[PDB]
């Protein structure tokens, strides 16, 4: 069996959900979403913010708790074939993390640009502020934490210790979410120019750099893949 169709679901769920989110923000961007003090803004974007925050907290708790509770206690008695299957599942988790990272840090972030640089601006919770900071960021954080936990709890290579590159890849992009505080402090007060390359944008960037730890993470996963079932063929 080895690599199964969980990868197709991993791609499709993010693609479909974010396409629907884009449709929603295209429909309610203007017209209930321009005026932050209008009653329709509360029903179409503040309610969205509340619901998405509650659902993200619940989903993160449930997913992380399930992954930690179903952790493999007897990692020693794991066959190489099962280890290969678990390595493929972890690679699917990493693919989902990469897809979520794309959607969060490229698509909806540069949609913050197109939005803040064309709209008259108004609150810390613009519809772009509900979709990017509080939906896509949390979603990729949840996916990254889940992938890290799966590696630690199913892969003997990633067990017996916390991998530094994986921890950086998982936590640095997470630090972008608390960095939103610098954003708010970085437009309201310091810098009223809607520049996206302002130093108040450095906390996100600096922590966007930490995603480069995926390189060490991926060579670690390559070594984990090539533990017992490294071949032969490769180097033979």
């Amino acid at each position: 069996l080895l690599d199964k169709k969980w990868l197709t679901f991993a791609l499709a769920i993010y693609t479909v959900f974010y396409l629907w989110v884009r449709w929603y923000e295209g429909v309610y961007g203007w017209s209930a979403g321009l005026d932050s003090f209008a009653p329709e803004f509360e029903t179409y974007w503040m309610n969205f913010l509340y619901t998405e925050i509650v659902l993200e907290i619940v989903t993160a708790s449930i997913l992380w708790g399930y992954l930690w509770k179903t952790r493999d206690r007897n990692l020693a008695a794991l066959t190489p074939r099962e280890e290969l299957r678990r390595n493929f599942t972890h690679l699917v988790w990493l693919v989902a993390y990469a897809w979520a990272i794309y959607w969060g840090a490229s698509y909806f972030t540069e949609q913050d640009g197109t939005w803040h640089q064309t709209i008259v601006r108004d609150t810390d919770f613009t519809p772009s502020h509900i979709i990017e900071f509080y939906l896509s960021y949390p979603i990729y954080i949840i996916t990254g934490f889940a992938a890290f936990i799966y590696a630690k709890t199913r892969l003997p290579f990633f067990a017996k210790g916390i991998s530094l590159p994986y921890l950086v890849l998982v936590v640095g992009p997470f630090m972008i979410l608390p960095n939103v505080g610098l954003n708010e402090w970085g437009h309201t007060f310091w810098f009223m120019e809607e520049l996206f390359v302002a130093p108040l944008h450095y906390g996100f960037v600096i922590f966007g750099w930490l995603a480069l730890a995926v390189m060490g993470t991926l060579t670690q996963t390559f070594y984990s893949f090539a533990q017992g079932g490294l071949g032969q063929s490769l180097c033979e």
Binding site: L34, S36, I119, V120, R121, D122, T123, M192, C235
Partner: protein
């Protein structure tokens, strides 16, 4: 749509927009709508806002639903940032061409280099038609007419696709062979020196030489075509001509100003001294995009936005005609739902509880006088 969130005192004391007019309220695609009016730069410019040494006359709108055909300060076109003087009154004119159908809230705004957006009154303008009918023709000094909607789009797409294809070809050339794990094992276990061998070096040399040669040839071709080019035209424009307003014949001294918390009314006591030779009457109080009118004295006919217009929102304790030379003190109350809708009541949250505004005084013959008032605004709770 971006105001009602800015600080009330900052909206009150930055820039006062008046004599605003709109040529049309409903337009077709490609039809032009003109916005005119005057703005006065308040003398008590807040220290937190940089002085309007570098300012841009902008339009508040949800993206290019209109295109700014022209914009004027004084009588001269202002496509760049301009320098404004504190205390001066300027007249402006913005010409917009409809591009996208719908109902749009169009604001005239002034962006200041170190203070952010100063949004004036916004008016709903309806656009009907189809976006596909929109044209933005322009004639260059080289004698060709192009449509700015799609000019150079094909060339941009072609060049970007070409370079993306070159990069993808490079990556795929290296990706035909196995990529990650066997190459990693070969590099780790002993010297590799086997995964990069001729003609890989020849292919890379070809890629490098072709890239440099294609860049040079494309630049030369883009220089032979379009032989006449100019850099981007930028730079703040000085010498904006302000309006030479006559000195007002009305002097007003604000003796305290209060507003109820909570409430929708603002109360102030004014000592009005009438100079000149005509009986005056208080007709309007404009504070921040909100016009409180005394309907018995003046009526608005310029189609001011209804949510910003208080037709009878200005009540004067004694608004009888003020004979020349006579001085009297009256209690003026400006009350309207706009005071709470546009969050002018939220000056209680502000770190500077001072207001500014314009009082419009009208005589019998109809000629009007504009006087500016500013004073601390004291909340009242009991």
């Amino acid at each position: 749509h971006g105001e009602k969130s800015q600080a009330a005192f900052m909206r009150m004391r930055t820039i006062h927009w008046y004599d605003l007019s709109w040529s049309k309220e409903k337009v077709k695609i490609n039809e032009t709508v003109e916005i005119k009016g005057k703005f006065h730069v308040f003398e008590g410019w807040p220290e937190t806002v940089d002085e309007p040494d570098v300012a841009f006359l902008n339009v508040g709108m949800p993206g290019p639903v209109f295109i700014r055909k022209e914009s004027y300060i004084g009588g001269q076109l202002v496509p760049r940032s301009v320098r404004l003087e504190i205390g001066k009154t300027y007249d402006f004119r913005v010409v917009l061409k409809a591009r996208r159908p719908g109902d749009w809230h169009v604001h005239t705004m002034m962006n200041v280099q170190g203070g952010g957006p100063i949004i004036g009154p916004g008016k709903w303008i309806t656009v009907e038609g189809s976006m596909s009918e929109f044209r933005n023709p322009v004639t260059t000094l080289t004698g060709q007419t192009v449509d700015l909607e799609n000019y150079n789009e094909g060339n941009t797409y072609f060049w970007h696709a070409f370079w993306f294809a070159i990069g993808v070809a490079w990556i795929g050339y290296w990706s035909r062979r196995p990529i990650f794990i066997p190459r990693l094992l070969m590099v780790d276990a002993g010297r590799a020196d086997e995964l990069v061998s001729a003609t890989d070096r020849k292919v890379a040399m070809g890629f490098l030489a072709a890239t440099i040669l294609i860049v040079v040839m494309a630049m030369s071709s883009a220089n032979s075509k379009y032989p006449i080019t100019i850099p981007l035209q930028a730079g703040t424009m000085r010498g904006m001509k302000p309006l030479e307003l006559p000195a007002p014949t009305v002097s007003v001294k604000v003796e305290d100003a209060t507003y109820r918390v909570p409430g929708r009314a603002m109360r102030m006591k004014l000592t009005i001294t009438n100079h000149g030779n005509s009986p005056i009457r208080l007709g309007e109080f404009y504070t921040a995009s909100v016009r409180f009118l005394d309907s018995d004295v003046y009526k608005d006919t310029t189609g001011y936005p209804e949510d910003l217009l208080a037709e009878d929102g200005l009540s004067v304790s004694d608004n009888s005609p003020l004979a020349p030379g006579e001085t009297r003190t009256v209690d003026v109350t400006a009350s309207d739902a706009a005071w709470e809708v546009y969050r002018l009541s939220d000056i209680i949250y502000d770190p500077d509880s001072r207001f500014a505004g314009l009082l419009f005084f009208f005589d019998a013959t109809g000629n009007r006088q504009v006087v500016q008032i500013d004073a601390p605004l004291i909340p009242s709770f009991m």
